[PDB]
C-alpha cells in the first residue's frame, strides 16, 4: 500500500506509512508477540465451519459499500482516458 | 519465564515520540509562510509533547536509572 | 481551563512518585473542574442556533454550555469518591464551629478511614478522568468530521484505561481487553462513516452537508444517497459505544468486571456527549418534505435499536442475580426511551429528550453512591454465608450479589428507602422524577403517531419492573445475613480520641467503640440531595423543565 | 544532602548545573527560545534591522480599476 | 564542624560504618558477657580468661566519660522512673513498640546495670516517603466477611495502636551524650585493637561464643583419647 | 612516522568517490545535449523544458527568435493517461 | 491524612489553578462586554473616542500586522468569539488584524464630523 | 547537534561502545547451540554499507557535502594586476610577473577547469575526503573505549540526548524567527 501510494504521487504519506507502521508498530507487535508464550494450536479454530458466513457477509457487504463509492474512485471497448 | 515490561516501554515511547516528530517534518519544510502564527502554534505543540516526556523522565518508565547508619542507639544509665 | 488543569496536574503528578499524594490530586482535580463551571456558566449571555469557533472546526450553542456544565458537574460528584475518605469517627464533644474549625481530634484513623485503600492509591486517576471529560465536551462542539473522529477517540481511549487501572485485578484487565477490543471496532464503523461522507460530499464541515442534504430535500445525475447510507454506519459505532441493543452484550460483562468506583465514572459520562451530540445531527437531516430520501432515512436505526433495547433490556434482566449486571440492563432499557424521544424529532420529544438525558444521569448516579456507600457500612458486620466467601474482587465491588443486600432495611433503614426511592424512579411510578420522564417520552410519541412503539413501551415497563422489585423485596422483605461484628463492641474494645487545641494541648481524651465509626458527610450529603431531587421534583419543576422548553425553542426557531 | 527547590531556590540551581547537567541546562535552553523572542527582536527594530517584505507566492494583482490601456492591437501585428 | 563523628559515615573498613553510640554500646556487650559466664564454672581457664580480658576493656572504656554525662544520667534517671510502664520490655516488647514511624525505647538490665535500647525511625526523603513512613500492610478487608477473616486481617489492633502525633500520655526519651571524635581516639588508644567500630564486632563475637562454650561444656573432661597410634608421623629414632 | 600502507585503503575510497561524480557529471552532460544538467526542477522548470521541446525538439534546446515557427501553435501536447487522477 | 510535605505541594497546584482561573475569568468578564453579551455603554463611549481618535490620526483602525493579510485572516476566525470556549480552551488575540465584525463607517464618520466642528471654531477665532 | 548525530549514528549502526548487547550472545552460547551468521556475507555488507552511507549523511548534512572551499575566490581578491599580455602580474608582497605560457598553460588549464569530468570529479573527491575522515572517527571510536552497557546507553539517549535535542527543537526556530531568517521553501537552489 505505501508503493502504491509513493507510486501515484503521495510520497510524503506514503513514507509516513513506511516509517510509522512498518517502522513502529509492526515492531511493538513483534515485540509483544516474541514475549508472550503462544502455543499455536490453541489460537487454531475450526475455520471451515465459517465459510458459508464467509460466503454470505462478503456478499451483503460488496453489493452494498460498492454503490457508496464515488465515480472517480471506481473510474477503473472504447475506454475512456 | 515472565519477560521484561520495559522491553513494550521501549517500542511504546519511541512510537509515540516517533509520531511527535514526524508531526513536526511539515513545519520545517513550511517555516517562511508559517511565521510567527505558525511558530506559537508549534510550539504549544511542542510544548505539550515535552511534558508528557518529563512524565516518563519522572517516572523512570522505561526502568533506566534505580540499579548504612544503625538505627539502634544504646544509652548507659550505670547501677541499679 | 481543562486544558489547562490537565497540564499543571500531569506537572505535578509527574515528579512525585508518592501514592500517599492522590487524595489530594483528586481534591484540586474538583476545584480545576469549579473554575471550568465558572468560565461555561458566564459564555451563556447569546442566542444562536450555534457560532462555529476555531476555524469552524468547533461551534458553541447554548445547549453546548449547558450540557459542558452538566458534564463538568457531575464529574465533581463522582469525584469526591476519591476525594474524601470512605467513613470518619464523629462525637458530639467535636461538632461545633470551635470544634471543627480551631480544635482537632488525634487517633488511629488508618484501619478505620482504610486510608491505603486502593481506590486512594492510583495517582493518575484524577488526571485519566480529565481526559475523558476533554473528550466529552469536545465531541458535544465538534462541526467537523475530523474533530468529531479525534474527540470520540479522545473520550474511548480514556475510557478503556480507567477501566484497566486496577492493574492487579484479573476481572478489571479483563475487561478493559473486551472494551477496547469491542471499542476499537467500533470506531471502525465511526471512521468508515466520516470517510464516505466526505468521499461522496468532498467536505468534512457538518453545516456544507446540512446544507446539501437541505438542496437534495425537495419533493438527477446524483442522488444524495450516501448521506443517509453514510450516517447509518455512522451511528452504528455511536451505537455499540451507548450500548443500545442490538450492539449491548459488552455492557454487562464490561460494568461488573470493573470496580464499582470506576463504573460509576464509565457507565454515565460516556452516554451524556454521545447523546447530545446525535440530537443536532437529527435535527439538520430532517427530510421536511416527504420524499424518497425519508425512506432511507438513518433514523429508522435508533427506532429498532430502541425497540430492541426496551425488549432486550427488560426481559434479560428478569434473570440476573448479580446486582452490577442487573444495573447495566436497566441502563439498556433506559437507553430505549432516550432512543425513542431522539428519533421521533418534534419540539415535544427533544424537550422531553433533554430531561430524560439529565434526570437519568442524575438518578443512576444515586444508584451508584449507595451502592458503593452499603459497601463501605458492612465494615462493622460480619456474616458466614457459605456463597459470599467464594466471590472475586471483594474489595473493588463489595456488593457483588443482590443477595449480599437482604435484610438492608433491619441494618440502615433510610439509606434503603433511599435505594427505593431511586429503584422506584427508574420503575417510572409518580410522583418520583423518573415518571414526569417518561410520561413526556410517550406523549411526545402518542402526539406524533409513535401509538405502536408506546404500547411497546409501557409493556415492556412492566417487565422491566419486575427486577426492580426484586431488589426491593430483598432488601426489606427478609432479615439480613450480615451481624454486627461481635468484636467491635466487645466493652474491652474501645479506641482512645484526643482533642487538642490550636497550640496542640489536650482539651480532652474520649473512649470509643464501633458505634462511633460512620459513613463520611460527602456520601451521606450527596446521597441526600439527591433523593430528595427526585421525591420533591413536583414542588421544583419551574426552571428545569423551563431552561429545555427554551433550549429546543432556539434549536427549532426559524 | 541534596537540596530541595522551594526551600532554597538558588542552592538548588547550583546542584542542578553540577548534578544533573543535561537536564538542568535542557530546562535552561529551552527557556533561552521563549527569552529570544522576547528581546532580540524589539532590539533590532531598536538598531534599524527592519524584517524584509514578504517574497510574493501568488501573481501581484494590482488594486483599483483597469487602466485602460492603448498599444500593441490587431492593427499592429 | 569535626568534634562528632558522624554516624554512619565510612570508617575506610568496607561495610563498617561508623556506631551512632560507641562507648554504650561496648559498655552493654561486656556487662552482658560476664553475666552469661556465671553459667560457667569458676575453674575454667575459659572463664577465667575472658573474665580478666572483659573487664579490662570494661575499665578503660568506663575510663572515658562524655561531658555533660553527669547531668544527663540524672534527669534520665527520672525521666525512667516516673515513666517506667513507656520502656518495658514486658509491656512493648523486645523493640519498644510496633509504630516504627514513632521514636522507640526499652529498658534493659544486665549484670546490675541499666541500658535504654532506643530505635530510631529512619530519616528518609520528604519526596519519596509515603504516610510519614507508615508501614502499608495493605487494604482493609471490605465487602461480606467473615469474624475469623476480619480477625486474621487485624482488625483488633485498632484497639491497641496509636497515632504516631498522639503524644500526651509519653514522655520523649533523650538520647544520651556522646564521646568526641578526640576521646573516641584516646578510647582506641587504650584498648589497643583498632577502630573502634571493628571493637563493637570482637567485642560482639565474646558474647555470642560463651552461649556455644555453655552448650558444648568445653571444661569437661576430654571426650575422646587418642587411640594408639593417632598422630603418629614418620619421625626417626 | 606516517604508516602510509594503512592509508593505502582510504585514498582508494577517495579515488571511487572521484570517479562516481567524475563519470556520472559526463554521462548527463551528454544526455543532456553536451550542456550541464538541471537539477532542483518544479512544475514550472519541467513545463519550461516542454515548450523547448516543442520550439526545438529537444527538451534542453534554446533558440532566440522572436517569433515561433509554424505549426507551434498545434504542438502543444496534451497528456493521456488510463488509470490516475 | 498525607505525609509530610504532601499539602505545601497541593497548595502551590491549587495556587497556580487559582491564579489560572482567575485571570480567565477576570479576561472574560472585560471581553463580554467588547461581544455585547454585557452591559457596556462605557466601553461604547471608551470605544469610539479612541477609534475616532486613531482615524483622524492616520492610524489604521486595528494597529499594523507583521503577519500576512492571509494570515491575519486565519488568526481572526480563530479568535473570533472565543473567550466563549475558555472553560474548555484558552485563546488570546496578539495580532493587529482589521476583522472585527463591525461597520466602521461610523468611526470615519464621527472624525468627520469632529473635523467639521473643529475647523469652524478655528475659522471664528 | 553534529556531536549528538554522530554519535547517534554509531549507537545507530550497533558499533562498538554500543554494542554490548549483540556482543553477550557469544558468551552465553553453551555447549548445545549456536549462530546463525556464519557463512553469509550479506549481514557484513549490510554492516560496512550502513556505517559508509551514515558517513555520506552525515557529511551531507553538517560538512560541505560536496562542497570544496574554492581558492579561487582568494586568487580573486589578492590579485590586482590583471595583464593582457599573460604576464598576470599580482599585487601581493610574495608576487612578481609570472611567466605562465599563454598558448601552452593558461589556455589548456582554464578548459579543463571547466570540464564536466575534472568538475565533478572535484565535488566527488571533496565528499570522498569528507566522508572518509568520518570513516577514521568511526575507527578511531572503536580502538578509543570500553563498551556502555545496554541500561547506560538507554540512559544516554533517553535521559540526556533527547532531552538535549528537545531543547534545541524548541531554540532554534525561535532564533530563526527572532532574525528574520526563516528560508523560503520554493524551488530555489
Ligand atoms: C515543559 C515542561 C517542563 C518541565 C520541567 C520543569 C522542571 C521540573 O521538573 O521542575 C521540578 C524540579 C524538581 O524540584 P523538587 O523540589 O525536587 O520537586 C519536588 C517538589 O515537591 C516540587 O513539587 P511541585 O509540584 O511544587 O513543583 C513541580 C512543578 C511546580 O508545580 C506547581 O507548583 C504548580 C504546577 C505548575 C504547572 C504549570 C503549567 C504551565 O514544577 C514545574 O514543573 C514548574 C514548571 C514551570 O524543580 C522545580 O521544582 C522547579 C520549579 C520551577
Ligand atoms: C438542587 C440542589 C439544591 C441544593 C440546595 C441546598 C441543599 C442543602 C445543601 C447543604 C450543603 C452543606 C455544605 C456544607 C456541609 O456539609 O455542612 C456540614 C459540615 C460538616 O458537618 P457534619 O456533616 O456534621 O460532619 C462532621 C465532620 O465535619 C466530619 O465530616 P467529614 O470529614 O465526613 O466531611 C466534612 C465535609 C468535607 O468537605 C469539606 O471539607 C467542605 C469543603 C468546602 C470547600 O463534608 C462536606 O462538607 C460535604 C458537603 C457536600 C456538598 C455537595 C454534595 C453534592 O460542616 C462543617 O463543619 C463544614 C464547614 C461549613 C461549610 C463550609 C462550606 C460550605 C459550602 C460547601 C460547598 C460544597
Ligand atoms: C491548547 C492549549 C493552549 C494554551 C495556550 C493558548 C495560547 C493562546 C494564543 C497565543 C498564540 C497565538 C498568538 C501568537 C501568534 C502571532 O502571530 O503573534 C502575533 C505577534 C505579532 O503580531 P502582530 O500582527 O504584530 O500583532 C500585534 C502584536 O501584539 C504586537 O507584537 P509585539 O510588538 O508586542 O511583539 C513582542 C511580543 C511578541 O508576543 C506577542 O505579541 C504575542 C505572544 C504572546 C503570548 C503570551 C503567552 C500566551 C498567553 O513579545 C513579548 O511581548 C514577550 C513575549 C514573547 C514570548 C514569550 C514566551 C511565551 C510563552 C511562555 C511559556 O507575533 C510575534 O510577535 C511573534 C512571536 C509570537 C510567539 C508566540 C509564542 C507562543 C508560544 C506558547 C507556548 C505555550
Ligand atoms: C438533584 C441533584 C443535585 C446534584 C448536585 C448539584 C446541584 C445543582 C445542579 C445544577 C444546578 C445549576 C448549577 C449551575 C452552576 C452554578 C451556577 C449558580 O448556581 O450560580 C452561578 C454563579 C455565577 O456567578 P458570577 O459571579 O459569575 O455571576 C455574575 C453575574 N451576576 C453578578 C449578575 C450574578 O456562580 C458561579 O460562580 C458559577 C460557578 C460556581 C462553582 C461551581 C458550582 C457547581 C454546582
Ligand atoms: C525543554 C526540555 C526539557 C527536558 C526535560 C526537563 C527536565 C524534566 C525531567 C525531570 C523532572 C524531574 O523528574 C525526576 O526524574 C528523576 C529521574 O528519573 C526521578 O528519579 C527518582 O525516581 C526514579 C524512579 O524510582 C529513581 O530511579 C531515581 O533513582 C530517583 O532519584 C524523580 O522521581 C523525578 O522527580
Ligand atoms: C433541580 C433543578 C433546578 C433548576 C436547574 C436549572 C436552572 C438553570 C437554567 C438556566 C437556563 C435557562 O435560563 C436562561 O437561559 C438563557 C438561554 O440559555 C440564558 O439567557 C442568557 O442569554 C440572554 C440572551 O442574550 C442574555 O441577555 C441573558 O442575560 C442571559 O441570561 C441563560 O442561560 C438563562 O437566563
Ligand atoms: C386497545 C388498547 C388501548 C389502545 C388505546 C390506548 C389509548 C389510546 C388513546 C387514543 O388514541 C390516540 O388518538 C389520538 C387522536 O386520535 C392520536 O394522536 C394523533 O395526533 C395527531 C394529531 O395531528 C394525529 O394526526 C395522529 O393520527 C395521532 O398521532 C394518538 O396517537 C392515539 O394514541
Ligand atoms: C528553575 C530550576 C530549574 C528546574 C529544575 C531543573 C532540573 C533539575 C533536575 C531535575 C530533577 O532534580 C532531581 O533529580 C534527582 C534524580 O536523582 C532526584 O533527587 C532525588 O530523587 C529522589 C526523590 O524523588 C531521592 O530518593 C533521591 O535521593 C534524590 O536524588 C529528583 O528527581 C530531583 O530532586
Ligand atoms: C438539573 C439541571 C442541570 C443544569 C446544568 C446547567 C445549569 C446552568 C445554569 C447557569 C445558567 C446561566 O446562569 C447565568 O450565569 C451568568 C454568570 O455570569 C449570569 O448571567 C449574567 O451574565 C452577565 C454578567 O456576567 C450579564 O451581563 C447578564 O445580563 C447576566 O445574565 C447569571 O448568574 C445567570 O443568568
Ligand atoms: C537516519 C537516516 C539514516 C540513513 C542511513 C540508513 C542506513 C540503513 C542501512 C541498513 C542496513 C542494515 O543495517 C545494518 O545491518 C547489519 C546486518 O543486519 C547490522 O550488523 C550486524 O551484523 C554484523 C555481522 O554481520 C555485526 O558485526 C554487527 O555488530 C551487527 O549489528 C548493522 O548493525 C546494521 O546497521
Known amino acids: 500500500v505505501s508503493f502504491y501510494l509513493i507510486l501515484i504521487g503521495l510520497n510524503f504519506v506514503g513514507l509516513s506509512y513506511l516509517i510509522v507502521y512498518i517502522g513502529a508498530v509492526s515492531i511493538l507487535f513483534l515485540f509483544i508477540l516474541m514475549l508472550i508464550n503462544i502455543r499455536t494450536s490453541e489460537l487454531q479454530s475450526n475455520t471451515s465451519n465459517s465459510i458459508p458466513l464467509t460466503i454470505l457477509v462478503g456478499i451483503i457487504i460488496s453489493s452494498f459499500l460498492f454503490k457508496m463509492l464515488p465515480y472517480g474512485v471506481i473510474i477503473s471497448k472504447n475506454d475512456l482516458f | 519465564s515472565p519477560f521484561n515490561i520495559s522491553f513494550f516501554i521501549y517500542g511504546l515511547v519511541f512510537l509515540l515520540l516517533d509520531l511527535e516528530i514526524l508531526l513536526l517534518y511539515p513545519f520545517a519544510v513550511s517555516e517562511y509562510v508559517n511565521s510567527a502564527y505558525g511558530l506559537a502554534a508549534a510550539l504549544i505543540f511542542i510544548g505539550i509533547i515535552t511534558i508528557g516526556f518529563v512524565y516518563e523522565l519522572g517516572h523512570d518508565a522505561l526502568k533506566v536509572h534505580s540499579r548504612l547508619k544503625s538505627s539502634v542507639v544504646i544509652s548507659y544509665l550505670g547501677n541499679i | 481551563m481543562i486544558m489547562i488543569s490537565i497540564l499543571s496536574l500531569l506537572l505535578s503528578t509527574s515528579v512525585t512518585l508518592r501514592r500517599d499524594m492522590s487524595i489530594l490530586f483528586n481534591r484540586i482535580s474538583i476545584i480545576a473542574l469549579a473554575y471550568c463551571i465558572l468560565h461555561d456558566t458566564m459564555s451563556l449571555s447569546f442566542i444562536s442556533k450555534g457560532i462555529g469557533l476555531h476555524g469552524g472546526l468547533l461551534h458553541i450553542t447554548n445547549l453546548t454550555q449547558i450540557f459542558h456544565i452538566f458534564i463538568f458537574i457531575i464529574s465533581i460528584l463522582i ?298 457500612s458492612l465494615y462493622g458486620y460480619v456474616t458466614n454465608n457459605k456463597e459470599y466467601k467464594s466471590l472475586l474482587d471483594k474489595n473493588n465491588s463489595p456488593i457483588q450479589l443482590i443477595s449480599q443486600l437482604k435484610g438492608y432495611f433491619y441494618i440502615n433503614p433510610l439509606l434503603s428507602l433511599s435505594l427505593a426511592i431511586t429503584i422506584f424512579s427508574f420503575v417510572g411510578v409518580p410522583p418520583l422524577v423518573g415518571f414526569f420522564a417518561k410520561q413526556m417520552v410517550l406523549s411526545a410519541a402518542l402526539d406524533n403517531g409513535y401509538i405502536f412503539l408506546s404500547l411497546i413501551a409501557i409493556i415492556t415497563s412492566v417487565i422491566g419492573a419486575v427486577y426492580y422489585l426484586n431488589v426491593i423485596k430483598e432488601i426489606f422483605f427478609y432479615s439480613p445475613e450480615h451481624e454486627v461484628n461481635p468484636v467491635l463492641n466487645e466493652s474491652d474494645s474501645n479506641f482512645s480520641l484526643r482533642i487538642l487545641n490550636e497550640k496542640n494541648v489536650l482539651i480532652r481524651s474520649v473512649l470509643l467503640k464501633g458505634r462511633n465509626i460512620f459513613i463520611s458527610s460527602p456520601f451521606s450529603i450527596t446521597i441526600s440531595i439527591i433523593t430528595n431531587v427526585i421525591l420533591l421534583f413536583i414542588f421544583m419543576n419551574k426552571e428545569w423543565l423551563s431552561m429545555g422548553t427554551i433550549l429546543v425553542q432556539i434549536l427549532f426557531s426559524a | 544532602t541534596t537540596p530541595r527547590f522551594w526551600s532554597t531556590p538558588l542552592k538548588y540551581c547550583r546542584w542542578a548545573a553540577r548534578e544533573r547537567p543535561a537536564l538542568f541546562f535542557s530546562v535552561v535552553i529551552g527557556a533561552l527560545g521563549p527569552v529570544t523572542l522576547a528581546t532580540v527582536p524589539p532590539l533590532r527594530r531598536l538598531i534599524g534591522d527592519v524584517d524584509a517584505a514578504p517574497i510574493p507566492l501568488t501573481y501581484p494583482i494590482p488594486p483599483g480599476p483597469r487602466k485602460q490601456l492603448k498599444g500593441y492591437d490587431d492593427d499592429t501585428e | 564542624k569535626g568534634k562528632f563523628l558522624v554516624p554512619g559515615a565510612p570508617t575506610g573498613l568496607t561495610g563498617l560504618g561508623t556506631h551512632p553510640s560507641p562507648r554504650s554500646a561496648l559498655l552493654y556487650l561486656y556487662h552482658s558477657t560476664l553475666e552469661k559466664l556465671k553459667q560457667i564454672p569458676e575453674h575454667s581457664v575459659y572463664r577465667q580468661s575472658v573474665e580478666a580480658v572483659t573487664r579490662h576493656r570494661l575499665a578503660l572504656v568506663e575510663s572515658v566519660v562524655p561531658e555533660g554525662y553527669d547531668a544527663w544520667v540524672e534527669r534520665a534517671k527520672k525521666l525512667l522512673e516516673e515513666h517506667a510502664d513507656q520502656f518495658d520490655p514486658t509491656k512493648v516488647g523486645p523493640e519498644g513498640g510496633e509504630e516504627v514511624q514513632g521514636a522507640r525505647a526499652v529498658k534493659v538490665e544486665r549484670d546490675g546495670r541499666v541500658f535504654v535500647v532506643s530505635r530510631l525511625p529512619k530519616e528518609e526523603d520528604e519526596r519519596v516517603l509515603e504516610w510519614d513512613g507508615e508501614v502499608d500492610e495493605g487494604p482493609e478487608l471490605e465487602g461480606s466477611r467473615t469474624l475469623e477473616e476480619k480477625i486474621e486481617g487485624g482488625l483488633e489492633k485498632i484497639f491497641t495502636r496509636r497515632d504516631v502525633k498522639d503524644t500526651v500520655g509519653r514522655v520523649e526519651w533523650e538520647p544520651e551524650p556522646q564521646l568526641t571524635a578526640e576521646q573516641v581516639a584516646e578510647l582506641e588508644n587504650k584498648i589497643g585493637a583498632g577502630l573502634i567500630e571493628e571493637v563493637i564486632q570482637v567485642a560482639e563475637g565474646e558474647l555470642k561464643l560463651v552461649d556455644t562454650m555453655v552448650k558444648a561444656r568445653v571444661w569437661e573432661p576430654l571426650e575422646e583419647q587418642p587411640r594408639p597410634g593417632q598422630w603418629e608421623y614418620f619421625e626417626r629414632k | 612516522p606516517v604508516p602510509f600502507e594503512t592509508l593505502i585503503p582510504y585514498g582508494i575510497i577517495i579515488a571511487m568517490f572521484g570517479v562516481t561524480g567524475a563519470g556520472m557529471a559526463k554521462v548527463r552532460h551528454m544526455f543532456n545535449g553536451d550542456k550541464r544538467h538541471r537539477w532542483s526542477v518544479d512544475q514550472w522548470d519541467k513545463q519550461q523544458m516542454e515548450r523547448d521541446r516543442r520550439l526545438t525538439g529537444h527538451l534542453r534546446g534554446q533558440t532566440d527568435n522572436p517569433i515561433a515557427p509554424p505549426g507551434f501553435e498545434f504542438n502543444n501536447p496534451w497528456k493521456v493517461x488510463x488509470x490516475x487522477x | 491524612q498525607v505525609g509530610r510535605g504532601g499539602f505545601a505541594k497541593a497548595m502551590r497546584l491549587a495556587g497556580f489553578i487559582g491564579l489560572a482561573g482567575g485571570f480567565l475569568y477576570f479576561y472574560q468578564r472585560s471581553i463580554l462586554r467588547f461581544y455585547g453579551m454585557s452591559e457596556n455603554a462605557r466601553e461604547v463611549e471608551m470605544d469610539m473616542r479612541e477609534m475616532t481618535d486613531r482615524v483622524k490620526a492616520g492610524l489604521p483602525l486595528y494597529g499594523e500586522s507583521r503577519l500576512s493579510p492571509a494570515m491575519q485572516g486565519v488568526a481572526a476566525r480563530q479568535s473570533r468569539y472565543s473567550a466563549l470556549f475558555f472553560g474548555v480552551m484558552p485563546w488570546f488575540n496578539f495580532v493587529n488584524h482589521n476583522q472585527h465584525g463591525v461597520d466602521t463607517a461610523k468611526y470615519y464618520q464621527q472624525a468627520e464630523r469632529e473635523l467639521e466642528a473643529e475647523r469652524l471654531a478655528r475659522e471664528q477665532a | 547537534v553534529f556531536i549528538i548525530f554522530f554519535i547517534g549514528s554509531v549507537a545507530e549502526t550497533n558499533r562498538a561502545p554500543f554494542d554490548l548487547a549483540e556482543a553477550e550472545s557469544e558468551l552465553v552460547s553453551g555447549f548445545m547451540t549456536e549462530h546463525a551468521a556464519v557463512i553469509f556475507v550479506f549481514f557484513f555488507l549490510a554492516e560496512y554499507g550502513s556505517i559508509v552511507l551514515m558517513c555520506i549523511l552525515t557529511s551531507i548534512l553538517f560538512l560541505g557535502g560536496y562542497l570544496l572551499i574554492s581558492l579561487l575566490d582568494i586568487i580573486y581578491n589578492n590579485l590586482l594586476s590583471w595583464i593582457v599580455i599573460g604576464k598576470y602580474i599580482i599585487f601581493i608582497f610574495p608576487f612578481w610577473g609570472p611567466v605562465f605560457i599563454d598558448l601552452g598553460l593558461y589556455e589548456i588549464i582554464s578548459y579543463l577547469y571547466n570540464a564536466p569530468t575534472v568538475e565533478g570529479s572535484f565535488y566527488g573527491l571533496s565528499l570522498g575526503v569528507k566522508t572518509s575522515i568520518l570513516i577514521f572517527v568511526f575507527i578511531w571510536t572503536r580502538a578509543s573505549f570500553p563498551r556502555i552497557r545496554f541500561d547506560q546507553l538507554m540512559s544516554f539517549c533517553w535521559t540526556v540526548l533527547l532531552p538535549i535535542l528537545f531543547a534545541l527543537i524548541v531554540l532554534v526556530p525561535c532564533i530563526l524567527y527572532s532574525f528574520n531568517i526563516f528560508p523560503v521553501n520554493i524551488s530555489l537552489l
Open chain 3, 79 to 376: 469525584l469526591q469518591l476519591t476525594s474524601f475518605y470512605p467513613r470518619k469517627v464523629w462525637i458530639p464533644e467535636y461538632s461545633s464551629l470551635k470544634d471543627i474549625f480551631f480544635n482537632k481530634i488525634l487517633y488511629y484513623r488508618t484501619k478505620i478511614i482504610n486510608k491505603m485503600g486502593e481506590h486512594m492509591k492510583i495517582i493518575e486517576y484524577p488526571l485519566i478522568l480529565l481526559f475523558v471529560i476533554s473528550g466529552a465536551v469536545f465531541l458535544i462542539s465538534t462541526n467537523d468530521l475530523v474533530s468529531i473522529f479525534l474527540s470520540i477517540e479522545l473520550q474511548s481511549y480514556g475510557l478503556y484505561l480507567l477501566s484497566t487501572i486496577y492493574r492487579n485485578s484479573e476481572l478489571s484487565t479483563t475487561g478493559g481487553l473486551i472494551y477496547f477490543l469491542l471499542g476499537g471496532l467500533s470506531s471502525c464503523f465511526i471512521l468508515l462513516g466520516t470517510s464516505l461522507l466526505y468521499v461522496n460530499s468532498g467536505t468534512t464541515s457538518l453545516d456544507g452537508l446540512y446544507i446539501l442534504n437541505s438542496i437534495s430535500d425537495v419533493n438527477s445525475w446524483y442522488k444524495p444517497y450516501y448521506l443517509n447510507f453514510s450516517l447509518l454506519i455512522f451511528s452504528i459505532g455511536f451505537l455499540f459505544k451507548v450500548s443500545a441493543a442490538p450492539f449491548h452484550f459488552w455492557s454487562p460483562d464490561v460494568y461488573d468486571a470493573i470496580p464499582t468506583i470506576v463504573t460509576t465514572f464509565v457507565a454515565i459520562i460516556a452516554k451524556i456527549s454521545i447523546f447530545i451530540f446525535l440530537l443536532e445531527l437529527v435535527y439538520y437531516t430532517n427530510s421536511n418534505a416527504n420524499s424518497y430520501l425519508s425512506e432511507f432515512s438513518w433514523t429508522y436505526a435508533l427506532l429498532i435499536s430502541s425497540l430492541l433495547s426496551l425488549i432486550i433490556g427488560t426481559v434479560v434482566g428478569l434473570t440476573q442475580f448479580r446486582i452490577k449486571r442487573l444495573l447495566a440492563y436497566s441502563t439498556i432499557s433506559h437507553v430505549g426511551f432516550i432512543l425513542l424521544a431522539l428519533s421521533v424529532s418534534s419540539i415535544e420529544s427533544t424537550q422531553a429528550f433533554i430531561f430524560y438525558l439529565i434526570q437519568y444521569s442524575i438518578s443512576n448516579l444515586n444508584a451508584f453512591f449507595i451502592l458503593i456507600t452499603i459497601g463501605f
